[PDB]
């Protein structure tokens, strides 16, 4: 009965093999194909068991079906994933930890398998099974905050030891339950001066800085609203690709507009080193009717045009550059050139 996308499991297994020996250099970054695979593995993991059982629900509303062993162990996508190819990916994963990772395949496999298994980097689960029905809001919030923070903090530990600049896997949107992004930003950077380095974890910085200045629920100030499997998120600025990729949202989800502002919804690459986009203007549901691109070409990014922080919509940062060394992560190096290479679909 569960919807299990076996294709993403096969694509993930192939991605690990092709990258298991690729050493992480100073500017090494995860390619668009691999990001779209990682993006799809996590989203397919959630859709296998999308809701909690009515007799084992969280009174706080926390998505326990993606955080506890009780639901993850009977998640058919998690079960198929850990057993795929005689469980070879599980064998590789059991040998990895944060402090020994040196190659791309190790980096991707360890971070993703921890997420789809609900395990922190220290081995502890996100939420204990006994806490599924817990009413202790503050205690549950601390555990979810720890899991969400440690995913980003753990990758920064890797980036500081390797001296990498652009390796990035985000914390999916459901792990931000009651989490204060402004708190996560200050908690991590106040506690390790090495993360401030201009050549260390730039996409990790761009992901956390954006979330530090734009909350999850903007209420009356919200211009856009993403929703996937009940998990919602609001935006009032342009939404760069590293935000939609990091949180795990797709431009084919439920996008709702609350203003008449024009948005450019990039969905795919074209043969002219550009990006095809769809434009929306009216309020309401913005439905992308185009075909869903494959992992090689798929893009999730939105440029907002508001005439009432604008660098978030600049072409060369709203979309992650394919050249890893030319990825832009700040307003200082933000450029808006090359629009003649893009194409409107409408």
């Amino acid at each position: 009965v569960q919807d299990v996308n076996v294709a993403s499991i096969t694509a993930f297994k192939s991605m690990i093999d092709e990258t298991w020996d690729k050493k992480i250099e100073a500017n090494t970054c995860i390619s668009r194909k691999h990001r779209n695979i990682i993006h799809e593995v996590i989203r397919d993991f959630m859709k296998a068991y999308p809701k909690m059982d009515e007799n084992k629900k969280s009174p706080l509303g926390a998505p326990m079906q993606w955080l506890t062993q009780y639901y993850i162990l009977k998640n058919e996508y998690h079960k198929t994933m850990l057993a795929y190819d005689n469980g070879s990916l599980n064998t590789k994963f059991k040998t990895l930890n944060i402090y020994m990772i040196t190659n791309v395949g190790q980096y991707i496999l360890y971070i993703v398998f921890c997420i789809i298994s609900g395990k922190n980097h220290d081995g502890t689960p996100y939420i204990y099974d006994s806490e599924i029905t817990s009413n202790d809001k503050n205690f549950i919030n601390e555990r979810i905050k720890y899991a969400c923070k440690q995913i980003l903090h753990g990758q920064l530990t890797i980036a500081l030891r390797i001296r990498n600049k652009f390796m990035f896997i985000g914390s999916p949107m459901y792990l931000w339950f009651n989490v204060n992004g402004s708190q996560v930003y200050h908690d991590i950077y106040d506690r390790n001066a090495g993360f401030h380095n201009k050549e260390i974890g730039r996409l990790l910085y761009a992901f956390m800085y954006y979330l530090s200045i734009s909350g999850r629920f903007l209420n009356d100030f919200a211009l856009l609203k993403f929703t996937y499997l009940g998990e919602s998120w609001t935006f009032s600025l342009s939404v760069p690709e590293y935000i939609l990729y990091g949180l795990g949202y797709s431009v084919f989800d439920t996008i709702e507009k609350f203003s008449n502002d024009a948005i450019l919804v990039y969905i795919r690459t074209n043969n002219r080193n550009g990006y095809d986009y769809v434009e929306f203007n009216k309020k309401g549901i913005a439905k992308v009717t185009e075909d869903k691109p494959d992992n090689d070409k798929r893009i999730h990014a939105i440029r907002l045009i508001n005439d009432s922080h604008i660098h978030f919509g600049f072409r060369n940062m709203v979309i992650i550059d394919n050249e890893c060394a030319n990825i832009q992560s700040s307003a200082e190096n933000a450029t808006d050139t090359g629009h003649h290479q893009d194409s409107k679909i409408n």
Partner: antibody
Amino acid sequence: QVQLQESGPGLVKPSETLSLTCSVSGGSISTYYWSWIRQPAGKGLEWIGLMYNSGSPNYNPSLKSRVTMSGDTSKNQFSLKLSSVTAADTAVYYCARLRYDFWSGSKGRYYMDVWGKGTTVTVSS
Amino acid sequence: DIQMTQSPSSLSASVGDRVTITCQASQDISNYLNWYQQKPGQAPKLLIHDASNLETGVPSRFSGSGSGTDFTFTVSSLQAEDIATYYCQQYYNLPFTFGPGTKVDIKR
């Protein structure tokens, strides 16, 4: 481990320009927001102005013409310049880190949680 | 700008007493209020943010409440080391403005 330390000349002649510098360690000035606060001897605290991580400054309208705040990324410092000083500018000047919060409304929440030791400046001939 | 008042200007209490300081705003500032503790010879130390949320490491004897224009700061069991001047400060509108401060003295 964010730590701040003020520095500058302790004496400034009237009508001349006060110049102070805040040295930041344990993190980049481009990571946080900052602010200057002064307190005359035996009096209260007066907020002088803030500086965002982009370097854009916002000053107190009381001093809105005499103040200039700028950041130096190469030295990881930011400065405070106050022109046409009088005796009303004799005070202990503090620089502080302005931690922000944008997850409880669009109106940002700002807290001065990390303070420097402060420097004493006297306006006299 | 938004003007802050504090009452009393000073007070003397014995060790163990319950002390309460009040802070009033000239207009509605919601809970955009901070509480600082400035011990003699030191910079102000932030104790409570957003009217009621304690900073990390602040002793549990300190607490604050209030929303709108009137705010309250309470020390449940006053300690001898708590001798300082306590300020409230709003960040609802620019410029940020502080209160006149309340001096808390120890009676022995």
